[PDB]
Coordinates of C-alpha atoms in Angstrom, one line a residue:
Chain X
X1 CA 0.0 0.0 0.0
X2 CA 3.5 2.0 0.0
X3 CA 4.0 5.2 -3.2
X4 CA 7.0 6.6 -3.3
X5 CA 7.3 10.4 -3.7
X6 CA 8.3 12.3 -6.9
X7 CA 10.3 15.2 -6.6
X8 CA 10.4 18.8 -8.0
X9 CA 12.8 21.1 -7.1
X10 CA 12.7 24.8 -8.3
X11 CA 12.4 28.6 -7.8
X12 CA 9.1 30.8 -7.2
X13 CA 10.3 33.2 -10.3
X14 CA 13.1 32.9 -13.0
X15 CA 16.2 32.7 -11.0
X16 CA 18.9 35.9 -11.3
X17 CA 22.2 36.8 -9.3
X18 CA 21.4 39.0 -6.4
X19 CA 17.6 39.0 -6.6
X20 CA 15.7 37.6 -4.0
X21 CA 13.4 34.5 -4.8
X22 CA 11.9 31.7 -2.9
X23 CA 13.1 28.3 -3.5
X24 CA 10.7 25.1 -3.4
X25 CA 10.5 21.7 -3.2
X26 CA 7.0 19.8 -4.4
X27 CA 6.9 16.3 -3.3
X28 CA 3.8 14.3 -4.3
X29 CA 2.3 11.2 -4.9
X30 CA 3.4 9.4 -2.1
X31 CA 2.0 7.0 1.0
X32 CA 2.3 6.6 3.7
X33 CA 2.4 10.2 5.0
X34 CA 5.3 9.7 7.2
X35 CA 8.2 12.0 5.4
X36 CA 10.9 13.7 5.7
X37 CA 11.8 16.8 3.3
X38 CA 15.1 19.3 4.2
X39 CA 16.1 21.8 1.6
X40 CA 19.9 21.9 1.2
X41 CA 22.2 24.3 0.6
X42 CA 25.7 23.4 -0.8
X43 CA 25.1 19.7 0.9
X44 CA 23.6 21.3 4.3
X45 CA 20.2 21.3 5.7
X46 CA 18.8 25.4 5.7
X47 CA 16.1 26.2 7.3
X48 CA 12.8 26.2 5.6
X49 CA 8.9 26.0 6.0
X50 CA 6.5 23.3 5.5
X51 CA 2.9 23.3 3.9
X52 CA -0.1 21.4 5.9
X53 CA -0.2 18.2 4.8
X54 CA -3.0 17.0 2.1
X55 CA -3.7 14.7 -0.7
X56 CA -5.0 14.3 -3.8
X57 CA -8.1 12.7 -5.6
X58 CA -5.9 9.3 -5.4
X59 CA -5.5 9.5 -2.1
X60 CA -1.5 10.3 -2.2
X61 CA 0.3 12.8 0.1
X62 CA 1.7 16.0 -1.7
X63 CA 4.2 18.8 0.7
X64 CA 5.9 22.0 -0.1
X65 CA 8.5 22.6 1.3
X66 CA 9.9 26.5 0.7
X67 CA 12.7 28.6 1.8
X68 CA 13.4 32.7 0.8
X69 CA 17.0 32.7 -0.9
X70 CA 18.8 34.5 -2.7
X71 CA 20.8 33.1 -6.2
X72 CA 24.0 34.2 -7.0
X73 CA 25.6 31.6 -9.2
X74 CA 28.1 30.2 -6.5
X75 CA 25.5 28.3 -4.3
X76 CA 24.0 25.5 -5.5
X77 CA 21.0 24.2 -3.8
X78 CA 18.9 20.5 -3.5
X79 CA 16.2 18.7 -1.6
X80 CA 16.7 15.4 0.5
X81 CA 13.6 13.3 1.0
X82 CA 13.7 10.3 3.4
X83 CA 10.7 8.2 2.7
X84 CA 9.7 4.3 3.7
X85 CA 9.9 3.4 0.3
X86 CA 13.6 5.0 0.0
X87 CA 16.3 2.5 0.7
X88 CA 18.3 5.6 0.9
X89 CA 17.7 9.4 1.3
X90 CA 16.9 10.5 -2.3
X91 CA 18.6 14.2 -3.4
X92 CA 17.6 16.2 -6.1
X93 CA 19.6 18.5 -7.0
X94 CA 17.8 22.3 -8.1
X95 CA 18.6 22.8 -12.0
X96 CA 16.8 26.2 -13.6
X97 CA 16.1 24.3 -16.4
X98 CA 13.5 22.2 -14.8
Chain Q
X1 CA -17.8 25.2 7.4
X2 CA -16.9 21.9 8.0
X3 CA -19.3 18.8 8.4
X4 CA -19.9 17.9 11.9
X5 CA -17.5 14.7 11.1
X6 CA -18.7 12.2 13.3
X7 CA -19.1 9.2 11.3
X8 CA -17.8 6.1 13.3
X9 CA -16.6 3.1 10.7
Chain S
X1 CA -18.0 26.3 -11.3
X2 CA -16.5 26.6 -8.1
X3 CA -16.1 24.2 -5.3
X4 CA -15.5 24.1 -1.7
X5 CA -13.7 20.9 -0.4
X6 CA -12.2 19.6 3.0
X7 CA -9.1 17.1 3.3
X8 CA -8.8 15.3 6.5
X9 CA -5.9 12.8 7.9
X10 CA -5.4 11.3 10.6
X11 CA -2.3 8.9 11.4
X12 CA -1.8 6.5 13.8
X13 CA 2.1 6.4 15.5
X14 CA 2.1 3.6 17.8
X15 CA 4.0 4.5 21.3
X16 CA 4.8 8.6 20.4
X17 CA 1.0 9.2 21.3
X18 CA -2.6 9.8 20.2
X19 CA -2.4 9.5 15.9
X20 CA -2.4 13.1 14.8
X21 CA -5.0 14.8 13.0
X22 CA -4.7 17.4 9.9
X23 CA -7.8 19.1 8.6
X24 CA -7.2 21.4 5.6
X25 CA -9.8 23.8 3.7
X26 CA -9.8 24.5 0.3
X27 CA -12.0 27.0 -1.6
X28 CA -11.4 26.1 -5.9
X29 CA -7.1 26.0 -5.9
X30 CA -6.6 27.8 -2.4
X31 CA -6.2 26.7 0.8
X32 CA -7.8 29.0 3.3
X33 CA -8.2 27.3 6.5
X34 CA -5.9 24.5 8.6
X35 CA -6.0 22.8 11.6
X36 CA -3.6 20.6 13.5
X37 CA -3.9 18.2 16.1
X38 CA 0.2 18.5 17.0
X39 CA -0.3 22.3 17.1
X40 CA 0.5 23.4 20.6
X41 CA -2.9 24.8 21.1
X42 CA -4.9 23.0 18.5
X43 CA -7.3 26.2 16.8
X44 CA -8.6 25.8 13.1
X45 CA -6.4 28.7 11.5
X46 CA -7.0 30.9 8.5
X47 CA -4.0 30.7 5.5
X48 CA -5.4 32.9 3.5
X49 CA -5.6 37.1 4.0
X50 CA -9.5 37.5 3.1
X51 CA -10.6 34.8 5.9
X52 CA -9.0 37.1 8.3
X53 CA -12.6 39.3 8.5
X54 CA -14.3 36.0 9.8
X55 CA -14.8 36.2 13.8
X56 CA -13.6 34.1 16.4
X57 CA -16.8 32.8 17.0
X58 CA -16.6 31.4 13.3
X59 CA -13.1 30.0 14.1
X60 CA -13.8 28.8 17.6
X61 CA -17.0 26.5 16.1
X62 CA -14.7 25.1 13.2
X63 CA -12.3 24.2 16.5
X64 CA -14.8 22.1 18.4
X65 CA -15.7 20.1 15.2
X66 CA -12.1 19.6 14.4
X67 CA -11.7 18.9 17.7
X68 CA -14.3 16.1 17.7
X69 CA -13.3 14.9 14.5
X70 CA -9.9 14.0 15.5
X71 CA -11.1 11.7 18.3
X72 CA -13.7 9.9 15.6
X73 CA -11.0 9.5 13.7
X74 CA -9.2 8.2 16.4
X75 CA -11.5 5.8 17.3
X76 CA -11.9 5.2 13.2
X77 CA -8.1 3.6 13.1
X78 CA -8.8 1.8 16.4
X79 CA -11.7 0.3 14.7
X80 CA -10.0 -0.7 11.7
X81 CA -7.3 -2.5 13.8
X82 CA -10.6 -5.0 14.5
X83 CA -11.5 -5.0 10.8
X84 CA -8.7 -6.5 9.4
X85 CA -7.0 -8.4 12.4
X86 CA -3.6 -5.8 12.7
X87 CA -1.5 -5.5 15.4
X88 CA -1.7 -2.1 17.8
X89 CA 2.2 -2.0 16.5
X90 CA 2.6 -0.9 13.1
X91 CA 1.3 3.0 12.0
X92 CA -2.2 3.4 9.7
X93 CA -4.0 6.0 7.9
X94 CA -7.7 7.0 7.8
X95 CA -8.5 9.9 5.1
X96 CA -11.8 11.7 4.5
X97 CA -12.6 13.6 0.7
X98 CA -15.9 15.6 1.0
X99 CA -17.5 18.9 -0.4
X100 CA -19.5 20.3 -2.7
X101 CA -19.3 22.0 -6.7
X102 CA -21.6 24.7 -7.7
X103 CA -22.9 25.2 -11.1
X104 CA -23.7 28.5 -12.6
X105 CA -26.8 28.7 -11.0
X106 CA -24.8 29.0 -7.9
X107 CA -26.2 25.2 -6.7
X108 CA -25.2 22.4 -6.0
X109 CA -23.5 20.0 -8.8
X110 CA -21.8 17.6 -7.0
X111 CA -21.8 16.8 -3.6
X112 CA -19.3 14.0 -3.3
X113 CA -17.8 12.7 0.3
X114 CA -15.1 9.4 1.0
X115 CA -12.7 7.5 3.0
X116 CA -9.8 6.1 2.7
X117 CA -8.3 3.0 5.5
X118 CA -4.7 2.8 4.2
X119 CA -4.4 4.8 0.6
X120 CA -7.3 2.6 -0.4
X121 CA -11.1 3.5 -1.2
X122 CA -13.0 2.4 2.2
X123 CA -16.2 4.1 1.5
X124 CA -18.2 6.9 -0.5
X125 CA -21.6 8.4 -0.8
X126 CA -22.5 8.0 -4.2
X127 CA -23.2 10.5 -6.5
X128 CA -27.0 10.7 -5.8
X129 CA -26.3 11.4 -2.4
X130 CA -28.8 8.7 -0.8
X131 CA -26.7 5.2 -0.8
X132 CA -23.1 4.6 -0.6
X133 CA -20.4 2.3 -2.0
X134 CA -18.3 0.0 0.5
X135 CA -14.5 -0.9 -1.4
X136 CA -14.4 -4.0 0.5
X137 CA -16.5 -6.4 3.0
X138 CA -15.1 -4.6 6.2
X139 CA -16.6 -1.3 4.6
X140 CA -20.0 -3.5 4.4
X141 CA -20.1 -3.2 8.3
X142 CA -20.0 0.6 8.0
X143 CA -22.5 0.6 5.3
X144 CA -25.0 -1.1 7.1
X145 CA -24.7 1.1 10.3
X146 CA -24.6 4.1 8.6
X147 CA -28.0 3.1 6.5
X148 CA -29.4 2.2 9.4
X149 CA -28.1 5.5 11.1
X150 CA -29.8 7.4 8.4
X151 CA -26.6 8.9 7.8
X152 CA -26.8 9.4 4.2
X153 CA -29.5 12.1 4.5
X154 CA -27.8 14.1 7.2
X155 CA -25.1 13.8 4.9
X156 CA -26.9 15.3 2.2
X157 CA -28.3 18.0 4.2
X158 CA -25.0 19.6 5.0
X159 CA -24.1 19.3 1.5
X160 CA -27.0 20.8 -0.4
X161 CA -27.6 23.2 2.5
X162 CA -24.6 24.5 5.0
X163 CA -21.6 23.6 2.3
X164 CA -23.1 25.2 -0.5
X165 CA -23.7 28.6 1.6
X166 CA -20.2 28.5 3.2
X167 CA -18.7 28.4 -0.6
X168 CA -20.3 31.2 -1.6
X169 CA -19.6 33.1 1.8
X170 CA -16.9 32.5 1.4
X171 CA -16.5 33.4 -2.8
X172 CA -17.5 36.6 -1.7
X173 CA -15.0 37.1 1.2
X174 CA -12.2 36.8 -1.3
X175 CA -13.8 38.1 -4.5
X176 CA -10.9 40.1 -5.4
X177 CA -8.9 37.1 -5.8
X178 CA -10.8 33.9 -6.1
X179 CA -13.0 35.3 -9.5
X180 CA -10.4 36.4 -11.5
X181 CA -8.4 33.8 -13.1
X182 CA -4.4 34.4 -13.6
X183 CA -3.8 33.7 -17.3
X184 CA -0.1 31.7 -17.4
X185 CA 3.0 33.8 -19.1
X186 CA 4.4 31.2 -21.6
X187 CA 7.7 30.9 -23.1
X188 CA 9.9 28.0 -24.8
X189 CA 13.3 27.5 -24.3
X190 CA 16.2 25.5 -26.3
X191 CA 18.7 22.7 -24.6
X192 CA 20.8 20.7 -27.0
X193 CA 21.3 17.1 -26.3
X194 CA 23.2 16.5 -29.0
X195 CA 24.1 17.8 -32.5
X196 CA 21.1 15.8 -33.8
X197 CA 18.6 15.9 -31.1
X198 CA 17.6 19.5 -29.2
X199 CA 14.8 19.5 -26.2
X200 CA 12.4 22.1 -26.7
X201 CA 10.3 23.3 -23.1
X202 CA 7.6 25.0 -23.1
X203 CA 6.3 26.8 -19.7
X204 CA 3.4 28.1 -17.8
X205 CA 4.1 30.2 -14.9
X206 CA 1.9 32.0 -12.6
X207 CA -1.5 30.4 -13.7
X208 CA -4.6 30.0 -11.6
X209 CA -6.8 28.2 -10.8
X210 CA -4.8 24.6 -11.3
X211 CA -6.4 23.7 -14.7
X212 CA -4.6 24.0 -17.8
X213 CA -3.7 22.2 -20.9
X214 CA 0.3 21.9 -22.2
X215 CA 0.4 20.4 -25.3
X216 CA 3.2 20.0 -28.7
X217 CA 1.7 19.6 -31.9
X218 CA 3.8 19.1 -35.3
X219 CA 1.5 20.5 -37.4
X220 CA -1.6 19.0 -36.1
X221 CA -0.8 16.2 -34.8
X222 CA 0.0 16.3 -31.1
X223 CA 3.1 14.5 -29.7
X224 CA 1.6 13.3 -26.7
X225 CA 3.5 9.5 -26.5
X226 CA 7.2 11.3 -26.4
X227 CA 6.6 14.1 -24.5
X228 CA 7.4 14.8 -20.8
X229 CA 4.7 16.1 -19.0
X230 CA 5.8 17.7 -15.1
X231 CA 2.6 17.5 -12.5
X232 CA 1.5 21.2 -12.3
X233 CA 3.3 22.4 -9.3
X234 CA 2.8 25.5 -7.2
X235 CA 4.7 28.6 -7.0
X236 CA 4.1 29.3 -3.7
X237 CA 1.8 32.3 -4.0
X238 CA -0.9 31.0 -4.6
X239 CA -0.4 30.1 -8.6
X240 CA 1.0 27.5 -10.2
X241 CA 3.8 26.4 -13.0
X242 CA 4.2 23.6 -15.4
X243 CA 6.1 23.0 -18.5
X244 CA 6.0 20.6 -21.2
X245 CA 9.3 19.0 -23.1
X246 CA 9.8 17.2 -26.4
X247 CA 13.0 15.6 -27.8
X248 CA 13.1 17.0 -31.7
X249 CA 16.0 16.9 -34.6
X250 CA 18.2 20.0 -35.1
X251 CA 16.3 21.8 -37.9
X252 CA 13.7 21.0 -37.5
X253 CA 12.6 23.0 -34.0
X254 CA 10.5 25.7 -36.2
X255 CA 7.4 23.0 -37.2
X256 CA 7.1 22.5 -33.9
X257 CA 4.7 24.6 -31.6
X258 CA 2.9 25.0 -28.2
X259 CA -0.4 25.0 -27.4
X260 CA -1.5 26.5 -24.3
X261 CA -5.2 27.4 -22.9
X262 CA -6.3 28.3 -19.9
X263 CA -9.6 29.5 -18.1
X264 CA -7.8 32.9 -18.2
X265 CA -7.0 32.9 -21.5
X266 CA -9.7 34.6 -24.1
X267 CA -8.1 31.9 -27.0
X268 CA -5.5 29.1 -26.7
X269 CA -1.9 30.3 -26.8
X270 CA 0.1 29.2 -29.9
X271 CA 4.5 29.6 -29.0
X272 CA 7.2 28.1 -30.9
X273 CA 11.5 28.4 -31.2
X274 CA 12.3 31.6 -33.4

């Protein structure tokens, strides 16, 4: 009865060097609800906010999980998501083009 | 508002 | 058509305490009301600016149902333990889907309500709104009670009646946002895979409500089968983004365009590579 999560990772608005911008990571699609999402921040954990959890029409869990940065072509940035159905911690990593 | 929710399976 | 419609959760976490309980409201594409059980002083919570004019003896009712819900639910996984012969050990889920559409006559067009034991259907008032569909036989135990509890009418009542009048209350609280739909601000861009193969993307940013439709068509024919198509995801303010990529020759990019519509859009957008 186990989904595992899929994983986007991106930015509120296009992403410039110096400009302020929020930076998100949309989980979804997943169950059981037990789940754990950090944003990271050159390999280490930042601090960042989580939405209330809900699901969709197939019953499946979906989180945001969102932090205010700011770009500036030196940092790069990813999400870590530790999930039942995750032998280990799954990164994305957070590429403009997607 | 919500439904009162108290349906017991 | 507009639609209010309720998510509920509850989980069960053997030995770190009573299973929690999430409750979150959404009017159309917004959420604009939360509660949580885990909260340190559980309160059902406005998430959205134009719920902020609603008193606390609005907030304060939505509380004590929350509140009561969360021990049904409680009592709903305990329950299920019975119903399928599991241990008090491992951790379970009980979910509840209700709420109502409302056509342009500002009535009710669907009026739909379910559960979920595990990520799987448990049971669901029917479409008509007077009999209800059990997913398995355990669910055939609830059915029967909640015939004979005359539940299905009750449930119907609240959903013709007090759901329907909170959407609209609640339409006209946020009017300024909620009517008007963001049309999506489309673009492609170009990424070379090789010196044969280019992938062309074509977003949609800042749309709402959720809805829209992202699709490539080579004159006419629409490359649905080798196209990538990303779940619409949310921006964060309220909108949403999505794009839609397909592999195509070198050359060949210009006889290859986008079509995007959207409720906010007066007629379909048409984009392409220049």
């Amino acid at each position: 009865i186990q989904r595992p999560p899929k994983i986007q990772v991106y930015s509120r608005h296009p992403p410039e060097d110096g400009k302020p911008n929020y930076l998100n990571c949309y989980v979804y699609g997943f169950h059981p609800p037990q789940i754990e999402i950090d944003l990271l921040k050159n390999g280490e954990k930042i601090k960042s906010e989580q939405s209330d959890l809900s699901f969709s029409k197939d019953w499946s869990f979906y989180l945001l999980s969102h932090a205010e940065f700011t770009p500036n072509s030196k940092d790069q940035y990813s999400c870590r998501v530790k999930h039942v159905t995750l032998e280990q911690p799954r990164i994305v990593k957070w590429d403009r083009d997607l | 508002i919500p439904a009162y929710g108290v349906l017991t399976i | 058509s507009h639609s209010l419609r309720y998510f509920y959760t509850a989980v069960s976490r053997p030995g770190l305490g009573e299973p929690r309980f999430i409750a979150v409201g959404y009017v159309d594409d917004t959420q604009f009301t939360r509660f949580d059980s885990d909260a340190p002083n559980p309160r059902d919570e406005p998430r959205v600016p134009w719920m902020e004019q609603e008193g606390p003896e609005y907030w304060d009712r939505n509380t004590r149902i929350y509140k009561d819900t969360a021990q049904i639910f409680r009592a709903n996984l305990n329950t299920a333990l019975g119903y399928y012969n599991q241990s008090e050990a491992g951790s379970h889920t009980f979910q509840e889907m209700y709420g109502c559409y409302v056509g342009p006559d500002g009535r009710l067009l669907l009026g739909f309500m379910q559960f979920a034991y595990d990520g799987r259907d448990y049971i669901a008032l029917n479409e008509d709104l007077r009999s209800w569909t059990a997913a398995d036989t355990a669910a055939q135990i609830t059915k029967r009670k909640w015939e004979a509890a005359g539940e299905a009418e009750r449930q119907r009542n609240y959903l013709e009646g007090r759901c329907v009048e909170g959407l609209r209350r609640y339409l006209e609280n946020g009017k300024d946002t909620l009517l008007r739909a963001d049309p999506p601000k489309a673009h492609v861009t170009h990424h070379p895979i090789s010196d044969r193969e280019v992938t062309l993307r074509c977003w949609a940013l800042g749309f709402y409500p959720e809805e829209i439709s992202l699709t490539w068509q080579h004159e006419g024919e629409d490359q649905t089968q080798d196209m990538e198509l990303v779940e619409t995801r949310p921006s964060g303010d309220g909108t949403f983004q999505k794009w839609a990529a397909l592999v195509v020759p070198s050359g060949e990019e210009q006889r290859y365009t986008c079509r995007v519509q959207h409720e906010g859009l007066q007629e379909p957008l048409t984009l392409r590579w220049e």
